[PDB]
Amino acid sequence: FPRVKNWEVGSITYDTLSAQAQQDGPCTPRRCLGSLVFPAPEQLLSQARDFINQYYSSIKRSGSQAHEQRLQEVEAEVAATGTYQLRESELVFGAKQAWRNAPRCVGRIQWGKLQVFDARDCRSAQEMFTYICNHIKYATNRGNLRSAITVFPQRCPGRGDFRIWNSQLVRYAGYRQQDGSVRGDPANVEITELCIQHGWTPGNGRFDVLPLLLQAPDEPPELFLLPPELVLEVPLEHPTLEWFAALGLRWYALPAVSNMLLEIGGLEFPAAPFSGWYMSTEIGTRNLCDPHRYNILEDVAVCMDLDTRTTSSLWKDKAAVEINVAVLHSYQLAKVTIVDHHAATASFMKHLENEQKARGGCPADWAWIVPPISGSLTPVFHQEMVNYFLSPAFRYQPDPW
Amino acid sequence: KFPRVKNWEVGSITYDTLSAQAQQDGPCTPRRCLGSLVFPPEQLLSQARDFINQYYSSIKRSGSQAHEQRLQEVEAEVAATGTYQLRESELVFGAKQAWRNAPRCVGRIQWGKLQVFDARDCRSAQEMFTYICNHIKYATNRGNLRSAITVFPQRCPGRGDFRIWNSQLVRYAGYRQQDGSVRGDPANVEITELCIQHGWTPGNGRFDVLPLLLQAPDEPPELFLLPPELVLEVPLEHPTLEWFAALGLRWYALPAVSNMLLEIGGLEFPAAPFSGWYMSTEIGTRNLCDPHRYNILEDVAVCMDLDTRTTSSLWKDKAAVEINVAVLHSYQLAKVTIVDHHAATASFMKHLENEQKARGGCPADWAWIVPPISGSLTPVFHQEMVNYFLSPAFRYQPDPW
Ligand code: HEM
Ligand code: HEM
Ligand SMILES: Cc1cc(N)nc(-c2cc(CN(C)C)cc(F)c2F)c1
Ligand SMILES: Cc1cc(N)nc(-c2cc(CN(C)C)cc(F)c2F)c1
Ligand SMILES: C[C@H](O)[C@H](O)[C@H]1CNc2nc(N)[nH]c(=O)c2N1
Ligand SMILES: C[C@H](O)[C@H](O)[C@H]1CNc2nc(N)[nH]c(=O)c2N1
Ligand SMILES: [Cl-]
Ligand SMILES: [Cl-]
Ligand SMILES: [Gd+3]
Ligand SMILES: [Gd+3]
Ligand SMILES: [Gd+3]
Ligand SMILES: [Zn+2]
C-alpha cells in the first residue's frame, strides 16, 4: 500500500483503499499521465454484485438474508432482462458514493448532504425539462444553495439515451465573431452553434444564458428556454475598486454539471445533472482569467494602473487576486453561497482525515485539488495524494453530436 | 503507445514518442497514480553502451571511427577493472543531459549552457572544500550567476563515497528552543544539529549561514567554515512598503543542490553539486511562506494592515504577492540574477517546443513545473505533460547516516 506524507505536518498514512480500485487509469511504471484531462451479462453482474455489497455494508446488514436475497434478485433480473433496477435507497446511496469517489472534487466534505431527485420515470424531453427546472429551483434556493442531483432513466437495451447536450444547466453563449474572435464565453462556442442550428434566435451580449438542448431516447434534441427567473445571477463589483462594476461582468449562482455519466453497480445514467456551489477560483481565476476564456486579466491590470510591460512587477498575480476578491465580495453581497479556496481546501483536509478513518484512504487528483492561484498557501499543496477510480462514479462521456 | 498530449490554451496536440525510451520504472500503475509523491554486477555495460551511443548520436558520429573504438575501450575497462572512466567530453555531455532530463526542472531552456568542473581527481574533504569554493565563487560571479556543476570522484566498491552532508551549499541554521519550536530555517534543524554536534559554534540569529560537512571516502566528516565574502546574500526590501526592510529578511544568491546523485552511463557520483539561479517563487513563496519554513505570511499581512480574521479577504494571497515582489525587487537592485515565475514558465514552454523537435517529447513533472502561486496564470498549467525517467539523471539518495 502506498505511503502518503503530509509535508506541512510531517504526518504519514497508507492508502489501503487504492488496493480496491476497480477500473484502470492512464499511468504505467513507464510513464505518468496524471496531468491529462481526459485519461456482457457476467461483468454487469460482477459490478452489480460489488455495489450491492457496498450498499449492504453501509446499512450494517452485510451478509444478511436481505443481502443474499437482493443478490439473487439482481441475478434473476439480469438473466431474464439483461439489466436490473435500483431500489430507491440504493440509488440515493449510489449517487452519494459517486460524489464521494470523485477524485477531482475538492468539495467532498459535503458528500453525505446531497438531495437526490429520482426522475427515472421521466418520459419525454418536456418532462425532463420540468424536472430540470425543479432541480434548478430547489438547488438555487434564493442564493442559499443546496447540493442536488436529478437521475433520469438509465441506459437500457432497445432504446436510446436521455441526454442533456449542454455541459452545464447555466452557460453563457459564445458567439464566433466578425474578425474571428469570440463574444461571450469561448468554452461554449460549439453548444452555442448547436442551439442556433436547432432554432434558437441568438443574442449578442457577453452573458447570454443559453437554452437547453434536451434529448429523449431516439429523438432529436429539443430546445427549451430557461425561465429568466429560475437563473439567479450575480453582477460583479469590487469592494474598493469602484470602476470594476463598469466592466459589466456577471456570473451565475448555480454550478450544475449536466454532461457527465453516472455509473452505479454497472448501470449507466447518461443524464444525471448535479449541482453544488462555486469555489471562487473557478469563476475569478479560470472562467474570467484563462486566456481562452473571458481573458480579462490584462484589462483589469491596466485599469489598476499596474506596470504590464514587465512580468517581474507581478501585475498578473495582483490583478487576478483582486478579480477573486471581487467575485467573493459580489457573491456575499448578493447572499449567494460561495467558498474561497482557503476554506475549501481546509475542509478537504478534514475530508481526507475522515476518509482515512472511514475507508483507509481517499482517491484524489492533486493537480485538480490544488487551486489555480496561491497553490502552496493552501494545505492541500503539501499533501501527497493517491489517484484511482472507484465505483459508483461520475465518468466523462462523448458529446452526443 | 505514444501518449497524446494537448495544450488547452491553444488547442494544439503533440505525441510524446520519447516516452518509449523510459528505463527506470516510476511509481505509477494502471491501478493508481502516485505522481504527487515527492520521493516515490555487469549490468553496468548496457548502461555504458547506451550512454556512449547517446554521446555519438548527439555529435553526428554514430557508427563511425571513434564510436566503435570507444565502445571497445569501455568493454576492456570493465572487463579489466569492473568499471570505467568517462572521457572529459562525455562527462560534460552527461551532466548537461542529466539536467536536460530532470522532469521537475522548469529552467531547462538553459540546459545547453552549463559549466562542468571535473573534480574526479579529488581526495579528502580539504580538497573538496577548495573545489566547492571555486564553484561558489565562479557560479556567484558578483551576482551575475552562471550555472555550474562540480563532479567529485565516482563510486566504486570497497571504498566509501564522497558526500556533501548539506542538502545545499548555502543553508541557514535552524535552532530548537526551550519549547521545541525553531528559530531560523526549520528545513535545516537536523543538519544544524549535526554541525553543532561536530564542533560548530552556533549563532543566535534567524539567518546564520551553516558550515559545510564534507565527507571523504571512509573518513568521518569535517566542518568547513565557508568564506563569508564568498556567500552572497540579498537583504530583502520592498519597493513601496518601507517597513518591509525592518523585518530583517534575507536570502542567499546561489541555489546549489549538494545532496543529489549524478548517474551517467551506469556510473554514480554521490557528490556532484550543481547550481543555477533562483526562480523568485522558490524564495518568496516556498522558503518564506510555507508553514513549515519561515512561515512569515501572517507577519507581513499584519504589517500590511490586512484583515486576517476571514480567509475570504484573500489576505494570504495579497501578502504572498508582495513578498514575491520584494524578492524580485531586492535581487534586481542587488544585481543578482533571478527569474520570475511568468518569465520562467514562458521559457519552459519554449523548451518543450524545442525538445519536441529535437527529441520527440520531454519528461515533465506537472506538479513541480507549475509554480506555487498563480499556477493557472502561467502557460504550463494549461499544458498536459508526460513524466518518465531518462538517463543520465539526477537521482535522490539517502542521507549519509
Ligand atoms: C457543494 C459544494 C461543491 C464544491 C465547493 C465543489 C467544488 C468542485 C471544484 C472546484 C471542482 C473542479 C471543477 C473544475 O475545476 O472545473 C469540482 C469537480 C467535480 N465535482 Fe465538486 N463541488 C461541489 C459539489 C459537488 C456535487 C454535489 C457533486 C456531485 C454530486 C460534485 C462532483 C464533482 C465532480 C464529478 C467533479 C469532476 C468534474 C470533472 O472531472 O470535470 N461536486 N468540484
Ligand atoms: C539556470 C537556472 C535554473 C532555474 C531557474 C531552475 C529552476 C528550478 C526549480 C524552480 C526547481 C524546483 C525545485 C524545488 O522546488 O525545490 C528545479 C529543480 C531541479 N533542477 Fe533546476 N533550475 C536551474 C538550473 C539547474 C541546473 C544548472 C541543474 C543541474 C545541472 C538543475 C537541476 C535540477 C534538478 C535535478 C531539479 C530536481 C530537484 C528536485 O527534484 O528536488 N537545475 N529547478
Ligand atoms: C457540482 C460542481 C460544483 C462546483 N463548484 N464546480 C463544478 C464543476 C465546474 C466546472 C467548470 N469549470 C470550468 C470551473 C467543471 C466541472 F467539471 C465541475 F465539476 C461542479
Ligand atoms: C540548480 C537549481 C536552481 C533552482 N532555481 N532551484 C534548485 C533547487 C532548489 C531546491 C530548494 N527548494 C526547497 C526550493 C531544491 C531542489 F531540489 C532544487 F533543485 C536548484
Ligand atoms: C492540463 C492540465 O492538467 C489542466 O489545465 C488541468 C490542471 N488542473 C485543473 N484543476 C482543476 N480544478 N480544474 C481544471 O480544469 C484543471 N485543469
Ligand atoms: C505533495 C506535493 O507533491 C509536494 O508538496 C510537491 C508539489 N510540487 C512541488 N513543486 C516544486 N517545485 N517543489 C516542491 O517542493 C513541490 N512539492
Ligand atoms: Cl464554471
Ligand atoms: Cl531554496
Ligand atoms: Gd476606490
Ligand atoms: Gd474598456
Ligand atoms: Gd502602522
Ligand atoms: Zn501517474
Side-chain angles (χ1 to χ4, degrees), chain A residues 8 21 67 141 191 237 253-254 257 266 279 336 356 374 382 401:
Chain A
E8 171 180 341
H67 184 190
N141 190 27
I191 184 66
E237 70 170 52
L254 193 63
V257 174
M279 177 169 81
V336 178
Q356 195 58 36
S374 294
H382 325 286
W401 58 88

mmCIF file of all heavy atoms in Angstrom, chain A residues 8 21 67 141 191 237 253-254 257 266 279 336 356 374 382 401:
data_model
loop_
_atom_site.group_PDB
_atom_site.id
_atom_site.type_symbol
_atom_site.label_atom_id
_atom_site.label_comp_id
_atom_site.label_asym_id
_atom_site.label_seq_id
_atom_site.Cartn_x
_atom_site.Cartn_y
_atom_site.Cartn_z
ATOM 1 N N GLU A 8 3.539 19.573 5.425
ATOM 2 C CA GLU A 8 3.368 20.677 6.363
ATOM 3 C C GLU A 8 3.420 20.190 7.813
ATOM 4 O O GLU A 8 4.003 20.859 8.675
ATOM 5 C CB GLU A 8 2.064 21.418 6.071
ATOM 6 C CG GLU A 8 1.682 22.447 7.126
ATOM 7 C CD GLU A 8 0.389 23.173 6.808
ATOM 8 O OE1 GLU A 8 -0.038 23.165 5.635
ATOM 9 O OE2 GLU A 8 -0.199 23.764 7.738
ATOM 10 N N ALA A 21 -9.167 -0.376 -6.119
ATOM 11 C CA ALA A 21 -9.521 0.363 -7.328
ATOM 12 C C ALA A 21 -9.900 -0.596 -8.448
ATOM 13 O O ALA A 21 -9.083 -1.420 -8.875
ATOM 14 C CB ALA A 21 -8.360 1.257 -7.762
ATOM 15 N N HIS A 67 -29.617 -9.216 2.161
ATOM 16 C CA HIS A 67 -28.469 -9.023 1.280
ATOM 17 C C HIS A 67 -28.386 -10.138 0.243
ATOM 18 O O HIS A 67 -28.284 -9.875 -0.963
ATOM 19 C CB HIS A 67 -27.196 -8.960 2.128
ATOM 20 C CG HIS A 67 -25.947 -8.672 1.358
ATOM 21 N ND1 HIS A 67 -24.693 -8.782 1.922
ATOM 22 C CD2 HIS A 67 -25.749 -8.262 0.082
ATOM 23 C CE1 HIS A 67 -23.778 -8.454 1.029
ATOM 24 N NE2 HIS A 67 -24.391 -8.139 -0.098
ATOM 25 N N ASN A 141 -32.408 27.948 -4.373
ATOM 26 C CA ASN A 141 -32.949 28.275 -3.051
ATOM 27 C C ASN A 141 -32.705 29.747 -2.688
ATOM 28 O O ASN A 141 -32.344 30.073 -1.559
ATOM 29 C CB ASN A 141 -32.354 27.339 -1.987
ATOM 30 C CG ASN A 141 -33.059 27.460 -0.650
ATOM 31 O OD1 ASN A 141 -34.228 27.819 -0.600
ATOM 32 N ND2 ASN A 141 -32.344 27.178 0.438
ATOM 33 N N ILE A 191 -21.682 24.461 -28.380
ATOM 34 C CA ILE A 191 -23.062 24.328 -27.924
ATOM 35 C C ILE A 191 -23.893 25.521 -28.382
ATOM 36 O O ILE A 191 -25.074 25.380 -28.722
ATOM 37 C CB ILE A 191 -23.100 24.145 -26.395
ATOM 38 C CG1 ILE A 191 -24.524 23.909 -25.906
ATOM 39 C CG2 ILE A 191 -22.457 25.331 -25.685
ATOM 40 C CD1 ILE A 191 -25.133 22.582 -26.409
ATOM 41 N N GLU A 237 -18.825 43.243 -8.728
ATOM 42 C CA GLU A 237 -18.267 44.525 -8.331
ATOM 43 C C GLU A 237 -17.108 44.259 -7.383
ATOM 44 O O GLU A 237 -16.964 43.166 -6.830
ATOM 45 C CB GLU A 237 -19.331 45.419 -7.671
ATOM 46 C CG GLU A 237 -19.776 44.933 -6.290
ATOM 47 C CD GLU A 237 -20.638 45.951 -5.549
ATOM 48 O OE1 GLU A 237 -21.629 46.421 -6.144
ATOM 49 O OE2 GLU A 237 -20.318 46.278 -4.378
ATOM 50 N N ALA A 253 -25.282 31.805 -10.240
ATOM 51 C CA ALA A 253 -25.159 31.246 -8.889
ATOM 52 C C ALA A 253 -24.875 29.743 -8.905
ATOM 53 O O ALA A 253 -24.100 29.237 -8.090
ATOM 54 C CB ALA A 253 -26.446 31.530 -8.095
ATOM 55 N N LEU A 254 -25.512 29.002 -9.807
ATOM 56 C CA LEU A 254 -25.573 27.556 -9.664
ATOM 57 C C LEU A 254 -24.571 26.876 -10.586
ATOM 58 O O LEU A 254 -24.708 26.992 -11.813
ATOM 59 C CB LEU A 254 -26.989 27.065 -9.988
ATOM 60 C CG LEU A 254 -27.256 25.627 -9.584
ATOM 61 C CD1 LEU A 254 -27.136 25.472 -8.078
ATOM 62 C CD2 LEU A 254 -28.686 25.219 -10.088
ATOM 63 N N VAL A 257 -23.308 20.585 -13.332
ATOM 64 C CA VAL A 257 -22.732 19.785 -14.404
ATOM 65 C C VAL A 257 -23.798 18.838 -14.944
ATOM 66 O O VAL A 257 -24.402 18.079 -14.181
ATOM 67 C CB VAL A 257 -21.515 19.012 -13.895
ATOM 68 C CG1 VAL A 257 -21.008 18.069 -15.003
ATOM 69 C CG2 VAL A 257 -20.403 20.004 -13.505
ATOM 70 N N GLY A 266 -22.736 -0.982 -12.234
ATOM 71 C CA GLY A 266 -22.781 -1.384 -13.618
ATOM 72 C C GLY A 266 -23.895 -0.769 -14.443
ATOM 73 O O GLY A 266 -23.870 -0.891 -15.670
ATOM 74 N N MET A 279 -16.683 27.319 -5.777
ATOM 75 C CA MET A 279 -15.470 27.857 -5.181
ATOM 76 C C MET A 279 -15.012 29.046 -6.014
ATOM 77 O O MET A 279 -15.007 28.983 -7.244
ATOM 78 C CB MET A 279 -14.384 26.791 -5.122
ATOM 79 C CG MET A 279 -13.035 27.278 -4.563
ATOM 80 S SD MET A 279 -11.952 25.914 -4.229
ATOM 81 C CE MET A 279 -11.306 25.573 -5.852
ATOM 82 N N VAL A 336 -25.375 34.849 -2.004
ATOM 83 C CA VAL A 336 -25.296 33.621 -2.782
ATOM 84 C C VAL A 336 -24.103 32.840 -2.255
ATOM 85 O O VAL A 336 -22.971 33.336 -2.294
ATOM 86 C CB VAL A 336 -25.140 33.897 -4.288
ATOM 87 C CG1 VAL A 336 -25.006 32.587 -5.065
ATOM 88 C CG2 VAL A 336 -26.287 34.706 -4.821
ATOM 89 N N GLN A 356 -9.711 8.678 5.770
ATOM 90 C CA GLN A 356 -8.694 7.759 6.275
ATOM 91 C C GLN A 356 -9.279 6.848 7.352
ATOM 92 O O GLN A 356 -9.141 5.617 7.294
ATOM 93 C CB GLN A 356 -7.496 8.548 6.815
ATOM 94 C CG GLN A 356 -6.231 7.708 7.023
ATOM 95 C CD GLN A 356 -5.752 7.029 5.753
ATOM 96 O OE1 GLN A 356 -5.849 7.586 4.662
ATOM 97 N NE2 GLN A 356 -5.237 5.821 5.892
ATOM 98 N N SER A 374 -2.374 30.697 -5.696
ATOM 99 C CA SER A 374 -1.977 30.512 -4.309
ATOM 100 C C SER A 374 -1.901 29.036 -3.923
ATOM 101 O O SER A 374 -2.251 28.662 -2.809
ATOM 102 C CB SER A 374 -2.921 31.273 -3.382
ATOM 103 O OG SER A 374 -2.794 32.677 -3.578
ATOM 104 N N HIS A 382 0.791 20.627 0.135
ATOM 105 C CA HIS A 382 1.761 19.848 0.885
ATOM 106 C C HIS A 382 1.237 18.477 1.277
ATOM 107 O O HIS A 382 1.802 17.837 2.166
ATOM 108 C CB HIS A 382 2.184 20.634 2.130
ATOM 109 C CG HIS A 382 2.253 22.109 1.894
ATOM 110 N ND1 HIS A 382 3.272 22.695 1.171
ATOM 111 C CD2 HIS A 382 1.417 23.115 2.247
ATOM 112 C CE1 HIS A 382 3.058 23.995 1.086
ATOM 113 N NE2 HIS A 382 1.950 24.280 1.746
ATOM 114 N N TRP A 401 -23.373 14.826 -30.231
ATOM 115 C CA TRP A 401 -23.386 15.211 -31.643
ATOM 116 C C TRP A 401 -22.124 14.779 -32.394
ATOM 117 O O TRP A 401 -21.184 14.224 -31.825
ATOM 118 C CB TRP A 401 -23.567 16.715 -31.769
ATOM 119 C CG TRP A 401 -22.512 17.475 -31.061
ATOM 120 C CD1 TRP A 401 -21.307 17.854 -31.563
ATOM 121 C CD2 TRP A 401 -22.555 17.955 -29.711
ATOM 122 N NE1 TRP A 401 -20.596 18.541 -30.616
ATOM 123 C CE2 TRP A 401 -21.340 18.621 -29.470
ATOM 124 C CE3 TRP A 401 -23.508 17.898 -28.689
ATOM 125 C CZ2 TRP A 401 -21.043 19.224 -28.246
ATOM 126 C CZ3 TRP A 401 -23.214 18.504 -27.470
ATOM 127 C CH2 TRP A 401 -21.980 19.148 -27.261
#
